[PDB]
């Protein structure tokens, strides 16, 4: 199952190409300016076989709870209503979001004790690095 090393609280320390990624999602300018300044905390928790990823920041809070391999309805930070799914691949915690015929991926993997989120949309790639805190 998900590695227990994911469990805990994570703080963003680096974000690369997040603006171009938000644009690819269709997020407008005012929202992107605040999104580019956000340094969110991400809390990953587990109750039985339901995993919860909770994102907290001054600008926006989000939370998804899910079971691996089971589609679920998601409301994203930019208020997209998506059909999403989280699965594992070589220990990486990979999320797909589908809506209005579009599709974006958020792959969260542990690299030397840090959590690295790789976000992809229409060939645009964003990388966000978190420290465990
Ligand atoms: C982080 C504040 C949200 C700002 C709202 C603008 C649109 C962003 C929507 C998608 C956010 C992607 C973040 C997931 C990757 C991560 O956990 O670092």
JSON list of C-alpha atoms and ligand atoms in Angstrom, two decimals:
[
{"chain": "A", "resi": 1, "resn": "UNK", "atom": "CA", "xyz": [0.00, 0.00, 0.00]},
{"chain": "A", "resi": 2, "resn": "UNK", "atom": "CA", "xyz": [1.01, 3.64, 0.33]},
{"chain": "A", "resi": 3, "resn": "UNK", "atom": "CA", "xyz": [4.35, 3.97, 2.10]},
{"chain": "A", "resi": 4, "resn": "UNK", "atom": "CA", "xyz": [3.96, 5.19, 5.67]},
{"chain": "A", "resi": 5, "resn": "UNK", "atom": "CA", "xyz": [6.71, 7.72, 4.95]},
{"chain": "A", "resi": 6, "resn": "UNK", "atom": "CA", "xyz": [4.07, 9.81, 3.16]},
{"chain": "A", "resi": 7, "resn": "UNK", "atom": "CA", "xyz": [2.17, 10.24, 6.43]},
{"chain": "A", "resi": 8, "resn": "UNK", "atom": "CA", "xyz": [2.62, 13.58, 8.17]},
{"chain": "A", "resi": 9, "resn": "UNK", "atom": "CA", "xyz": [2.83, 17.28, 7.39]},
{"chain": "A", "resi": 10, "resn": "UNK", "atom": "CA", "xyz": [4.68, 18.75, 4.41]},
{"chain": "A", "resi": 11, "resn": "UNK", "atom": "CA", "xyz": [5.69, 22.36, 3.67]},
{"chain": "A", "resi": 12, "resn": "UNK", "atom": "CA", "xyz": [6.37, 23.69, 0.18]},
{"chain": "A", "resi": 13, "resn": "UNK", "atom": "CA", "xyz": [9.94, 24.96, -0.17]},
{"chain": "A", "resi": 14, "resn": "UNK", "atom": "CA", "xyz": [10.30, 25.16, -3.97]},
{"chain": "A", "resi": 15, "resn": "UNK", "atom": "CA", "xyz": [7.97, 25.54, -6.95]},
{"chain": "A", "resi": 16, "resn": "UNK", "atom": "CA", "xyz": [9.09, 25.57, -10.59]},
{"chain": "A", "resi": 17, "resn": "UNK", "atom": "CA", "xyz": [6.86, 26.49, -13.54]},
{"chain": "A", "resi": 18, "resn": "UNK", "atom": "CA", "xyz": [3.69, 26.68, -11.44]},
{"chain": "A", "resi": 19, "resn": "UNK", "atom": "CA", "xyz": [2.41, 29.74, -13.31]},
{"chain": "A", "resi": 20, "resn": "UNK", "atom": "CA", "xyz": [2.54, 28.08, -16.74]},
{"chain": "A", "resi": 21, "resn": "UNK", "atom": "CA", "xyz": [0.85, 25.05, -15.16]},
{"chain": "A", "resi": 22, "resn": "UNK", "atom": "CA", "xyz": [-1.99, 27.14, -13.73]},
{"chain": "A", "resi": 23, "resn": "UNK", "atom": "CA", "xyz": [-2.41, 28.84, -17.11]},
{"chain": "A", "resi": 24, "resn": "UNK", "atom": "CA", "xyz": [-2.71, 25.45, -18.81]},
{"chain": "A", "resi": 25, "resn": "UNK", "atom": "CA", "xyz": [-5.55, 24.73, -16.37]},
{"chain": "A", "resi": 26, "resn": "UNK", "atom": "CA", "xyz": [-7.28, 27.98, -17.35]},
{"chain": "A", "resi": 27, "resn": "UNK", "atom": "CA", "xyz": [-6.70, 29.84, -14.07]},
{"chain": "A", "resi": 28, "resn": "UNK", "atom": "CA", "xyz": [-6.95, 33.61, -14.46]},
{"chain": "A", "resi": 29, "resn": "UNK", "atom": "CA", "xyz": [-4.31, 36.18, -13.66]},
{"chain": "A", "resi": 30, "resn": "UNK", "atom": "CA", "xyz": [-5.45, 37.47, -10.26]},
{"chain": "A", "resi": 31, "resn": "UNK", "atom": "CA", "xyz": [-5.81, 33.90, -8.99]},
{"chain": "A", "resi": 32, "resn": "UNK", "atom": "CA", "xyz": [-2.39, 32.92, -10.37]},
{"chain": "A", "resi": 33, "resn": "UNK", "atom": "CA", "xyz": [-0.64, 35.83, -8.65]},
{"chain": "A", "resi": 34, "resn": "UNK", "atom": "CA", "xyz": [-1.89, 34.57, -5.28]},
{"chain": "A", "resi": 35, "resn": "UNK", "atom": "CA", "xyz": [-1.24, 30.95, -6.25]},
{"chain": "A", "resi": 36, "resn": "UNK", "atom": "CA", "xyz": [2.36, 31.78, -7.14]},
{"chain": "A", "resi": 37, "resn": "UNK", "atom": "CA", "xyz": [2.83, 33.35, -3.70]},
{"chain": "A", "resi": 38, "resn": "UNK", "atom": "CA", "xyz": [1.17, 30.48, -1.81]},
{"chain": "A", "resi": 39, "resn": "UNK", "atom": "CA", "xyz": [3.48, 28.17, 0.16]},
{"chain": "A", "resi": 40, "resn": "UNK", "atom": "CA", "xyz": [0.98, 25.54, 1.30]},
{"chain": "A", "resi": 41, "resn": "UNK", "atom": "CA", "xyz": [1.19, 22.84, 3.93]},
{"chain": "A", "resi": 42, "resn": "UNK", "atom": "CA", "xyz": [0.09, 19.35, 2.88]},
{"chain": "A", "resi": 43, "resn": "UNK", "atom": "CA", "xyz": [-1.11, 16.86, 5.50]},
{"chain": "A", "resi": 44, "resn": "UNK", "atom": "CA", "xyz": [-1.34, 13.20, 4.44]},
{"chain": "A", "resi": 45, "resn": "UNK", "atom": "CA", "xyz": [-3.28, 10.92, 6.78]},
{"chain": "A", "resi": 46, "resn": "UNK", "atom": "CA", "xyz": [-4.68, 7.39, 6.71]},
{"chain": "A", "resi": 47, "resn": "UNK", "atom": "CA", "xyz": [-7.72, 5.89, 8.46]},
{"chain": "A", "resi": 48, "resn": "UNK", "atom": "CA", "xyz": [-7.84, 2.22, 7.53]},
{"chain": "A", "resi": 49, "resn": "UNK", "atom": "CA", "xyz": [-7.77, 2.11, 3.73]},
{"chain": "A", "resi": 50, "resn": "UNK", "atom": "CA", "xyz": [-9.01, 5.69, 3.18]},
{"chain": "A", "resi": 51, "resn": "UNK", "atom": "CA", "xyz": [-6.19, 8.17, 2.55]},
{"chain": "A", "resi": 52, "resn": "UNK", "atom": "CA", "xyz": [-6.72, 11.91, 3.04]},
{"chain": "A", "resi": 53, "resn": "UNK", "atom": "CA", "xyz": [-4.60, 14.63, 1.43]},
{"chain": "A", "resi": 54, "resn": "UNK", "atom": "CA", "xyz": [-5.39, 18.03, 2.95]},
{"chain": "A", "resi": 55, "resn": "UNK", "atom": "CA", "xyz": [-3.85, 21.21, 1.53]},
{"chain": "A", "resi": 56, "resn": "UNK", "atom": "CA", "xyz": [-3.81, 24.34, 3.71]},
{"chain": "A", "resi": 57, "resn": "UNK", "atom": "CA", "xyz": [-2.78, 27.85, 2.70]},
{"chain": "A", "resi": 58, "resn": "UNK", "atom": "CA", "xyz": [-3.80, 31.44, 3.34]},
{"chain": "A", "resi": 59, "resn": "UNK", "atom": "CA", "xyz": [-5.42, 31.60, -0.10]},
{"chain": "A", "resi": 60, "resn": "UNK", "atom": "CA", "xyz": [-7.15, 28.22, -0.44]},
{"chain": "A", "resi": 61, "resn": "UNK", "atom": "CA", "xyz": [-7.79, 25.02, 1.50]},
{"chain": "A", "resi": 62, "resn": "UNK", "atom": "CA", "xyz": [-8.58, 21.69, -0.15]},
{"chain": "A", "resi": 63, "resn": "UNK", "atom": "CA", "xyz": [-9.14, 18.12, 1.00]},
{"chain": "A", "resi": 64, "resn": "UNK", "atom": "CA", "xyz": [-9.65, 14.82, -0.81]},
{"chain": "A", "resi": 65, "resn": "UNK", "atom": "CA", "xyz": [-10.27, 11.42, 0.77]},
{"chain": "A", "resi": 66, "resn": "UNK", "atom": "CA", "xyz": [-10.04, 8.32, -1.37]},
{"chain": "A", "resi": 67, "resn": "UNK", "atom": "CA", "xyz": [-9.14, 4.67, -1.72]},
{"chain": "A", "resi": 68, "resn": "UNK", "atom": "CA", "xyz": [-6.40, 3.63, -4.14]},
{"chain": "A", "resi": 69, "resn": "UNK", "atom": "CA", "xyz": [-7.82, 2.62, -7.51]},
{"chain": "A", "resi": 70, "resn": "UNK", "atom": "CA", "xyz": [-11.36, 3.93, -6.90]},
{"chain": "A", "resi": 71, "resn": "UNK", "atom": "CA", "xyz": [-12.61, 6.92, -8.88]},
{"chain": "A", "resi": 72, "resn": "UNK", "atom": "CA", "xyz": [-14.16, 9.76, -6.87]},
{"chain": "A", "resi": 73, "resn": "UNK", "atom": "CA", "xyz": [-15.56, 13.26, -7.36]},
{"chain": "A", "resi": 74, "resn": "UNK", "atom": "CA", "xyz": [-13.12, 16.08, -6.60]},
{"chain": "A", "resi": 75, "resn": "UNK", "atom": "CA", "xyz": [-13.31, 19.85, -6.24]},
{"chain": "A", "resi": 76, "resn": "UNK", "atom": "CA", "xyz": [-9.89, 21.36, -6.91]},
{"chain": "A", "resi": 77, "resn": "UNK", "atom": "CA", "xyz": [-8.38, 24.54, -5.49]},
{"chain": "A", "resi": 78, "resn": "UNK", "atom": "CA", "xyz": [-9.40, 26.43, -8.66]},
{"chain": "A", "resi": 79, "resn": "UNK", "atom": "CA", "xyz": [-12.94, 25.02, -8.34]},
{"chain": "A", "resi": 80, "resn": "UNK", "atom": "CA", "xyz": [-12.73, 22.44, -11.13]},
{"chain": "A", "resi": 81, "resn": "UNK", "atom": "CA", "xyz": [-15.20, 19.57, -10.68]},
{"chain": "A", "resi": 82, "resn": "UNK", "atom": "CA", "xyz": [-13.22, 16.50, -11.74]},
{"chain": "A", "resi": 83, "resn": "UNK", "atom": "CA", "xyz": [-13.45, 12.74, -11.82]},
{"chain": "A", "resi": 84, "resn": "UNK", "atom": "CA", "xyz": [-10.19, 11.76, -10.15]},
{"chain": "A", "resi": 85, "resn": "UNK", "atom": "CA", "xyz": [-8.30, 8.63, -9.16]},
{"chain": "A", "resi": 86, "resn": "UNK", "atom": "CA", "xyz": [-5.18, 7.94, -7.09]},
{"chain": "A", "resi": 87, "resn": "UNK", "atom": "CA", "xyz": [-3.04, 4.85, -7.67]},
{"chain": "A", "resi": 88, "resn": "UNK", "atom": "CA", "xyz": [0.49, 3.66, -6.97]},
{"chain": "A", "resi": 89, "resn": "UNK", "atom": "CA", "xyz": [3.37, 3.03, -9.37]},
{"chain": "A", "resi": 90, "resn": "UNK", "atom": "CA", "xyz": [6.79, 2.01, -7.98]},
{"chain": "A", "resi": 91, "resn": "UNK", "atom": "CA", "xyz": [5.72, 3.59, -4.70]},
{"chain": "A", "resi": 92, "resn": "UNK", "atom": "CA", "xyz": [4.76, 6.91, -6.30]},
{"chain": "A", "resi": 93, "resn": "UNK", "atom": "CA", "xyz": [1.35, 8.33, -5.36]},
{"chain": "A", "resi": 94, "resn": "UNK", "atom": "CA", "xyz": [-0.20, 9.35, -8.68]},
{"chain": "A", "resi": 95, "resn": "UNK", "atom": "CA", "xyz": [-3.40, 11.37, -9.12]},
{"chain": "A", "resi": 96, "resn": "UNK", "atom": "CA", "xyz": [-5.31, 11.83, -12.39]},
{"chain": "A", "resi": 97, "resn": "UNK", "atom": "CA", "xyz": [-7.98, 14.52, -12.78]},
{"chain": "A", "resi": 98, "resn": "UNK", "atom": "CA", "xyz": [-10.41, 14.44, -15.72]},
{"chain": "A", "resi": 99, "resn": "UNK", "atom": "CA", "xyz": [-13.00, 17.08, -16.59]},
{"chain": "A", "resi": 100, "resn": "UNK", "atom": "CA", "xyz": [-14.55, 18.58, -19.73]},
{"chain": "A", "resi": 101, "resn": "UNK", "atom": "CA", "xyz": [-12.49, 16.20, -21.84]},
{"chain": "A", "resi": 102, "resn": "UNK", "atom": "CA", "xyz": [-9.23, 17.51, -20.35]},
{"chain": "A", "resi": 103, "resn": "UNK", "atom": "CA", "xyz": [-6.83, 15.67, -18.07]},
{"chain": "A", "resi": 104, "resn": "UNK", "atom": "CA", "xyz": [-4.02, 16.55, -15.67]},
{"chain": "A", "resi": 105, "resn": "UNK", "atom": "CA", "xyz": [-1.72, 14.43, -13.52]},
{"chain": "A", "resi": 106, "resn": "UNK", "atom": "CA", "xyz": [-0.15, 15.10, -10.11]},
{"chain": "A", "resi": 107, "resn": "UNK", "atom": "CA", "xyz": [2.51, 12.54, -9.18]},
{"chain": "A", "resi": 108, "resn": "UNK", "atom": "CA", "xyz": [3.84, 12.70, -5.61]},
{"chain": "A", "resi": 109, "resn": "UNK", "atom": "CA", "xyz": [6.99, 10.67, -4.89]},
{"chain": "A", "resi": 110, "resn": "UNK", "atom": "CA", "xyz": [9.51, 10.55, -2.06]},
{"chain": "A", "resi": 111, "resn": "UNK", "atom": "CA", "xyz": [13.05, 11.60, -2.99]},
{"chain": "A", "resi": 112, "resn": "UNK", "atom": "CA", "xyz": [15.67, 11.44, -0.22]},
{"chain": "A", "resi": 113, "resn": "UNK", "atom": "CA", "xyz": [13.02, 12.05, 2.43]},
{"chain": "A", "resi": 114, "resn": "UNK", "atom": "CA", "xyz": [11.44, 15.02, 0.62]},
{"chain": "A", "resi": 115, "resn": "UNK", "atom": "CA", "xyz": [8.10, 14.85, -1.18]},
{"chain": "A", "resi": 116, "resn": "UNK", "atom": "CA", "xyz": [8.21, 15.95, -4.83]},
{"chain": "A", "resi": 117, "resn": "UNK", "atom": "CA", "xyz": [5.02, 16.73, -6.75]},
{"chain": "A", "resi": 118, "resn": "UNK", "atom": "CA", "xyz": [5.24, 16.60, -10.55]},
{"chain": "A", "resi": 119, "resn": "UNK", "atom": "CA", "xyz": [2.22, 18.22, -12.21]},
{"chain": "A", "resi": 120, "resn": "UNK", "atom": "CA", "xyz": [1.58, 17.80, -15.94]},
{"chain": "A", "resi": 121, "resn": "UNK", "atom": "CA", "xyz": [-0.97, 19.46, -18.23]},
{"chain": "A", "resi": 122, "resn": "UNK", "atom": "CA", "xyz": [-0.79, 19.48, -22.05]},
{"chain": "A", "resi": 123, "resn": "UNK", "atom": "CA", "xyz": [2.99, 19.05, -22.03]},
{"chain": "A", "resi": 124, "resn": "UNK", "atom": "CA", "xyz": [3.51, 21.74, -19.36]},
{"chain": "A", "resi": 125, "resn": "UNK", "atom": "CA", "xyz": [5.41, 20.31, -16.39]},
{"chain": "A", "resi": 126, "resn": "UNK", "atom": "CA", "xyz": [5.55, 21.83, -12.90]},
{"chain": "A", "resi": 127, "resn": "UNK", "atom": "CA", "xyz": [7.73, 20.58, -10.03]},
{"chain": "A", "resi": 128, "resn": "UNK", "atom": "CA", "xyz": [7.02, 21.37, -6.37]},
{"chain": "A", "resi": 129, "resn": "UNK", "atom": "CA", "xyz": [9.30, 20.18, -3.56]},
{"chain": "A", "resi": 130, "resn": "UNK", "atom": "CA", "xyz": [8.14, 19.76, 0.05]},
{"chain": "A", "resi": 131, "resn": "UNK", "atom": "CA", "xyz": [10.05, 19.30, 3.30]},
{"chain": "A", "resi": 132, "resn": "UNK", "atom": "CA", "xyz": [8.55, 17.16, 6.06]},
{"chain": "A", "resi": 133, "resn": "UNK", "atom": "CA", "xyz": [7.83, 19.32, 9.09]},
{"chain": "B", "resi": 1, "resn": "LIG", "atom": "C1", "xyz": [-1.85, 26.14, -3.84]},
{"chain": "B", "resi": 1, "resn": "LIG", "atom": "C2", "xyz": [-2.90, 27.25, -3.83]},
{"chain": "B", "resi": 1, "resn": "LIG", "atom": "C3", "xyz": [-3.98, 27.05, -4.90]},
{"chain": "B", "resi": 1, "resn": "LIG", "atom": "C4", "xyz": [-4.08, 28.21, -5.89]},
{"chain": "B", "resi": 1, "resn": "LIG", "atom": "C5", "xyz": [-5.22, 28.06, -6.91]},
{"chain": "B", "resi": 1, "resn": "LIG", "atom": "C6", "xyz": [-4.77, 28.19, -8.37]},
{"chain": "B", "resi": 1, "resn": "LIG", "atom": "C7", "xyz": [-4.91, 26.91, -9.18]},
{"chain": "B", "resi": 1, "resn": "LIG", "atom": "C8", "xyz": [-4.16, 25.73, -8.65]},
{"chain": "B", "resi": 1, "resn": "LIG", "atom": "C9", "xyz": [-4.95, 24.43, -8.77]},
{"chain": "B", "resi": 1, "resn": "LIG", "atom": "C10", "xyz": [-4.08, 23.19, -8.73]},
{"chain": "B", "resi": 1, "resn": "LIG", "atom": "C11", "xyz": [-3.07, 23.19, -7.59]},
{"chain": "B", "resi": 1, "resn": "LIG", "atom": "C12", "xyz": [-2.04, 22.11, -7.75]},
{"chain": "B", "resi": 1, "resn": "LIG", "atom": "C13", "xyz": [-1.30, 21.78, -6.47]},
{"chain": "B", "resi": 1, "resn": "LIG", "atom": "C14", "xyz": [-0.97, 20.30, -6.34]},
{"chain": "B", "resi": 1, "resn": "LIG", "atom": "C15", "xyz": [0.51, 20.01, -6.26]},
{"chain": "B", "resi": 1, "resn": "LIG", "atom": "C16", "xyz": [1.09, 20.08, -4.82]},
{"chain": "B", "resi": 1, "resn": "LIG", "atom": "O1", "xyz": [0.46, 19.40, -3.96]},
{"chain": "B", "resi": 1, "resn": "LIG", "atom": "O2", "xyz": [2.10, 20.81, -4.66]}
]
